[PDB]
Design a protein around this ligand. Structure first.
Ligand SMILES: C[C@H](O)[C@@H](CCc1cccc(Cl)c1Cl)n1cnc(C(N)=O)c1
Ligand SMILES: [Zn+2]
Length: 349
């Protein structure tokens, strides 16, 4: 089957949408919460998607399965570990894994995510546990792993704990801040909780990505560049609808975090249209191919490669380019990014 069985890099993927059904059923039963089914399989199909789906019909998914894990130290670390193992199985050599620490917390967070009753697991201890699991992960399956903490659109009261958390735990394993959630909250990029968070990220060399352009307009991408100052964008499709902004980001060699399967699934991309990635490819963009959420999208990395191979003419050589780029566009430190590149230059020949 495999579409490029060469090593890859991956920059854009959510931990909380990368759990095994059966680890969820496990803490489900283990921790008396009821999941809406009782085989890992009924579950998949259920948190699984095979059509677009409304912002809420899509967020409710986080309630089928997140109260199994959040709260639970052992669970959190377990998911971090088995994410890594998951990525070894796709043939990846470097992954940047992203999440919100508040969304696995049950203490020292307002408001309490997912109906949790208040407990003791805080947003700081989530980071440690995620680290513990990601590092031990790395050691066992030999994948390189960094993490990325997400800010939430709708909750810029979190944002500075986020940067702070990012600086606290830097390369041990965190590399950057993100912006995620409902990109269609109006004004949201400029919410001063977020601006100051990114600004602070700039004060103290923390790398930046932001979700934009997947659903919200080209305006949201340019607030991402100009005001939050990102180095990378997650998605950035709608970038096309402003020629000058596309132009200048092509010229700046901005990184595009592309999630092709994800976008058909979500609705973001519709199929009587030109898929945005093909454009990128035609235009020699800096972009990577990424999976977003293996859980929700019923996917693996090779899913993504299949569609562009099989649907969009992607040749192996683009594959190569795109991985080289993503490596190039890692939030790794300089010295260790060169070493990623040596690894891929050699594997690609
Ligand atoms: C970013 C974090 O790493 C979680 C957050 C999921 C979530 C939960 C509550 C409220 C909102 Cl709006 C969202 Cl998107 N995450 C997981 N998958 C996505 C996605 N594709 O948007 C976001
Ligand atoms: Zn994402």
């Amino acid at each position: 089957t495999p579409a490029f069985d060469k090593p890859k890099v991956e920059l854009h993927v959510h931990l909380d949408g990368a759990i095994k059904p059966e680890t969820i059923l496990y803490y489900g039963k283990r921790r008396g919460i009821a999941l809406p089914a009782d085989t890992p399989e009924e579950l998949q199909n259920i948190i699984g998607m095979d059509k677009p789906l409304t912002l809420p019909d899509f967020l409710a998914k986080f309630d089928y399965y997140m109260p199994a894990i959040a709260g639970c130290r052992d669970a959190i670390k377990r998911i971090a570990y088995e994410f890594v193992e998951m990525k070894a199985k796709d043939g990846v050599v470097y992954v940047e894994v992203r999440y919100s620490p508040h969304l696995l917390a049950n203490s020292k967070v307002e408001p309490i995510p997912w109906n949790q009753a208040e407990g003791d697991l805080t947003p700081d201890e989530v980071v440690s546990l995620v680290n513990q699991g990601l590092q031990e992960g790395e050691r066992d399956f030999g994948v390189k792993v960094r993490s990325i903490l997400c800010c939430m659109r709708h909750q810029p009261s979190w944002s500075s704990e986020v940067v702070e958390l990012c600086k606290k735990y830097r390369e041990q394993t965190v590399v950057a801040i993100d912006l995620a959630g409902d990109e269609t909250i109006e004004g949201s990029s400029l919410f001063p909780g977020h601006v100051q968070a990114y600004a602070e990220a700039v004060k103290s060399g923390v790398h930046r990505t932001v979700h934009a352009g997947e659903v919200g307009s080209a305006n949201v991408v340019k607030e991402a560049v100009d005001t939050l100052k990102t180095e990378r964008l997650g998605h950035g499709y709608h970038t096309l609808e402003d020629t000058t902004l596309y132009n200048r980001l092509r010229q700046e060699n901005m990184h595009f975090e592309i999630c092709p399967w994800s976008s058909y699934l979500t609705g973001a991309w519709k199929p009587d249209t030109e898929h945005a990635v093909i454009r990128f490819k035609n235009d020699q963009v800096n972009y990577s191919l990424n999976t977003d959420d293996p859980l929700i999208f019923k996917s693996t990395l090779d899913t993504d490669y299949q569609m562009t191979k099989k649907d969009m003419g992607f040749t192996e050589e683009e594959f190569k380019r795109l991985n080289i780029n993503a490596a190039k566009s890692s939030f790794l430190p300089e010295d260790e990014k060169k070493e990623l590149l040596d690894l891929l230059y050699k594997a690609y020949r």
